[PDB]
Each structure stands twice: as C-alpha cells, then as structure tokens.
C-alpha cells in the first residue's frame, strides 16, 4: 500500500514533470542548419556551447553579445568601415575604414558531442560539457561533421492528461485507505 | 474461523494486488508491430529484452541509449554525415560523411520466448530470460516468426470494487469474532 | 452486479471503439470507379492490395512509389521520351525517346476477394489476403468483374453520444455499488 | 542515395527536351486544419467523459 502510494506518487510526480516539460516547448542572426553548437566563452574563460545564433557587436570588437562576451579564437571586430558578413562556412569578412576588405577576419568554430544528452544546461539554451557528454570536437561549418550555416499544444494535451493521471492515482489510493479505515476494525 | 480469516485475508490481499495491477495500466523511435522483443545488453554484457523502441545515439556509436548502452551484434554508429534510417526489416542504413551510403550498417535482431510469462521483470519494461521463459529465439523483423517493424479505468473500476471486497470481508470476520466474544461466554 | 459491471464495461468499451472508428472517417493518380484493388508487392515479393491510386515512377522504372516499390507483372518504365498514359483498361502506353510509342508497356491487374472483411489491414489502406478473405481473383479493369478505371461528423455525433453512453453506464454502476455499500450493512 | 546518381545530357538530346527559349491548397489547408480542431474536440469529450466517469 505504502508502496502503492509510492507508485502512485512516482507516477504523479512524473505527470507534473511531463506537463512541465510540455510547458517547456510550445544584431547578427546566424543559424545552424544541421548539427553542432557555437562555442562561447565567459569572462572567466570557461567554454560553453549554444545553438542560439543571436549576437551583437559590443564595445569591444570580439563577437560580444548583449552582455559583452566575445568569440574565439583569434578574430575580433572593433571598427566601423562599412559592414560585415558571416559566410556559410563561418568565415567573417568585412568591408572597412582601414581601406581594405578582409576575409577571415576570423572564422567561427562549431562543436559536436558524442552525447548531447550528457550536456549540462546552464540556462538560456547554453550548455556545458560534462564527463557524460564527452569532450567537444571542433570543426567548421560546411566541413566534415558540420553542415553549412543556413544563410507543443500536443505537449499541453499530454500534460493535461498526464496531470489528470495523478489525480486518478490519488483517487485510487484514497479509496484503499478509506477501505482500510473502514476495515479498521471489523 | 482463523481459516476464514485467512480466506478473507487472502482475498483481501488479492484485492489490493488487483487494484495495484489496475494502477499499473492506465531520438529514434522504433516500434514492433507484432511479437518479439529487441535484444539489449548492459555494460556487463548480460542480455535483456524489451519492446521499448526508444533509443538515442550516444557518444559512442553503438545503439546507445540515454545511459549509453549499445546494441548487438556487429553494427555501430559513430559519425555525423547526413542522417540514418532503420528499415522495416531492422536493417540500419545511413548516409555519411565518409562519402558513402552504407546498407546494413547493422541489422537489429528480435527475440521471442516460449512463454513471456516466465520472463523476469527488471523494471522499465525490460525483461530477462529465465528457466521458465525458455531461451530466446533470435530472428529478424519481417522474417519467420517476426512481423515487420511498423514504420485501465476499467481496471480502476475493478480495483475499487475489489478493494471494496476486502472491506466487506473484514466486516464479515469482525462480526463473527464479535459473535464469538458475545458467545464467550454464554 | 459484477456481470452488470462487465456489461456496462463492454458497452463502454464499444463506445470508445465506435468513437474511434468515427474518428477514422471524416505523380500519377489512378482511381478505381467500382470494385477491385490494385495489386502491389514489397521488396520481399509479398503481395498486398490497395485502392490507393497514387504512384510515382521511381529511379527504377517499375511502377515505384514514394518508397520505390514497383508493379507486376511484366511491365516497367525506365525512360524519359515524352510522357506516358494509363488507359481505362489499365494498359500503360507511352511515347518514348526510343522512337516508338508502345502500347501495353504493361497492363495493371486488379484483384477482388470473396470477403473484403477478411482482409488484414497493414495500414495506409493497404491490405493482405487471409484465409478469411479468400484468395485474390485477378482480372483487368473493364472486363468481367471489374469496372473501368474512372479516368463523418455524423460519426462524431455518434461517437459523442456513444461515449456519453458509457458515462451513463458508469453512473449506474456506481450507484448500485454505493447502494450496496449503503446496504452494507443494514 | 535515394535519388540515384545524376545522369548528364544536353538539352534537345536523348532524355532532355530543348530549353524553351494553391488557393485550392489554402482551401485544403483550412479544412485540414479544421480537422484537427475537430479531432481535439472528440478527444476532449472522451476525457471529460472519463472524468465524469471517474468515479461512478
């Protein structure tokens, strides 16, 4: 019985989890068509990975975001000139004030892991490597492992049903307990 | 009387069991349309069987799951290339970076038992062979014994009624005992 | 009572089934005006039957579909020439690069069964012959048994009502049980 | 692999002809889209039914 309670409980817990997961579903912008993650570093120098393509050039040049974080390895962008572009391969090229158009101002690197499941979620769809994930393997878009850069309610349904399930589960448990109490004592 | 108590007891026990059973009822995904189980091995090398189709390719190639467990016998998957497919027969074919499309990278094997009842439940719908089950017989989907890969509340009702039953049972027992006590002594 | 429960249960089960069935209701394209099924074979060589007219010519000529499956018996199509046509009788004729217009490149065969009910559903409106169905009888469109090739919510209503029915059924059962419990003990 | 290898030729020869020199879908989509709406409706009722049933 207690076990049953546990059993019900566990299921109920799942149901909530499922629903929650269900809930969790339903300026330069670069997207990765296929597999791979962009590699990113914090001010500490720790490396992190993310599919999120949104970047802004901050005060410092280095590919800095809304926060200021730059990109690796040896390639920054601290000028005005004309514009800049990110090619399909990830090469960054620009037209500039210093009267030149550089190619490969820097080229973005991409990473892949043996198991994505292993990755530890920092939040904001940023992830960190773990023992389980395996080490990151680096490459560039359009070569080897990586493709080129390109340029829900059902869950809710689930969650509702799953959520419902626990409600059922509780119901069953209660009855028994009542039964027990009724039984106690015959 | 004690016997009756036992009798009631046994029934009551069943009732709980029934209810519990009642409770127990009500990324590549492959399903088995007909009979058969997928064959799976742990890190120890022990073999287990399961209908559950959910698999993920882990860091190692071998059909590894959320845990990392691979699949038998001689067929893994440690690359990126393009994609991969599992045919109806269980053959795994892929399109790859190593400029080739392999067929039968490996073919999944299926197992059947003389009596499924005999199988010992590990949990998570995974089962192990026993003396009672008989040895696993191996085959492939779409041949011989096995069909191709394809691509509740009533219990509650029962349980409630069954649960109720014991409550009745206890009631009967109590009365007698009371009767006995009343009888004691006349 | 238990029987009644069963009775209710059975009805309830049906109600769901009915609703479900209710749910289940509401490039060359060839349609069969009257009776008959197209005959089709898998890579294994097993024969299957379907009314579905949709076919595509795959890389191999043989009437291959989105999958590649061809058609029987002796008639393929592996060329470009101009076009191709399927006559009312099922004859396939083409205009071709090999400077000829063939007639009866091949002619499609149609099959009929003593009882369609017997047919076993593979899915995707494809069926396989069974003992119950009887053997397929072959013919061509426009001859004998077969006509020439040509060139719902109510269910929902039902389902809802039927679904409702079980709800009623359960209600009745519950009352009795309550009655019993009330009765127990008077 | 599925496509097969490309076979090459020139326009006007063999396999290739010379170089020369919708809403219905919408209709479909709307109806099809509608369909799921129906589908959901059916499901909900049953669940409600179940809940109503639970417990009788």
Residue numbers in the entry:
A (entry chain A), B (entry chain A), C (entry chain A): 1 to 26, 92 to 216, 226 to 260
D (entry chain A): 196 to 216, 226 to 260
From the paper:
The flagellum is made of three distinct parts: the basal body, which functions as a rotary motor as well as a protein export apparatus; the filament, a long helical propeller that propels cell locomotion in viscous environments; and the hook, which connects the filament to the motor as a universal joint to transmits motor torque to the propeller oriented off-axis of the motor. The rod consists of four different proteins, FlgB, FlgC, FlgF and FlgG, with an adapter protein, FliE, for their assembly on the MS ring. FlgF and FlgG are 26 and 29 kDa proteins, respectively, and together form the thicker, distal portion of the rod with about 20 nm in length and 13 nm in diameter. The rod is responsible for the stable high-speed rotation of the motor driving filament rotation up to around 300 Hz in S. enterica and E. coli and 1,700 Hz in Marine Vibrio15.
